[PDB]
Design a protein around this nucleic acid. Sequence first.
DNA 1: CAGCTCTGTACGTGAGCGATGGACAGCT
DNA 2: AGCTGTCCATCGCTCACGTACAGAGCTG
Length: 197
Amino acid sequence: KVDRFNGVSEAELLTKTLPDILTFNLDIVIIGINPGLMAAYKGHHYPGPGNHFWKCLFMSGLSEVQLNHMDDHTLPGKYGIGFTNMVERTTPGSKDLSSKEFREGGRILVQKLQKYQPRIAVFNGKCIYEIFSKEVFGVKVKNLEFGLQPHKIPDTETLCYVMPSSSARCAQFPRAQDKVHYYIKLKDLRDQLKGIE
DNA sequence: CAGCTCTGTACGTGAGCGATGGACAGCT
DNA sequence: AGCTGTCCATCGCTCACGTACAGAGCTG
């Protein structure tokens, strides 16, 4: 047997959850799919050694230095970035989640975005915006695209911005370099919004 | 037929764990 | 010289908070 969790069983991790890191007046909220086994283990956001999130945040210039999962609580105050996930339940990957779990997650998520009202709701994963869009805007497009979406969160000025998941599981964007374009465009969108203020 | 949803499957990088074995020092 | 055990460089395998797409099965 291969022990990847310092003697903590996978069964124990599957019952753990990952806390939200949300405040008012945030520029960005990063919305993941659900916690993976490493996030459940660490209790911090994107600790996976191969996950591209922290590398892309630095490569794009959203952080001035390369940060890691232990810095996630400093992001609202220092960078104006918060975190949540569409689904609370921990699983090894996105493929283990049911349709009902996603739609329950969607209803909870739209309520959270209506409370905190960040300038930008960032969907870290195309799959969660496909569900969100059909559930909240009642819109299903044949070719959903990444980047800025044409619908604001209902009863708010919060924009929806979609990126490919920072998980290294997706072969279509094999490296952090292949996803950094979306983080740079996210940065440009943030700077443009703050410019109008 | 044609378009839609649903399901099974295949897919490129890079990182940690466990196994292997060469270098090498200590000791007779 | 011969033995022996540790260190650690390196390899192979598994995995990672998914995604695009064919093709079957509905339905208009």
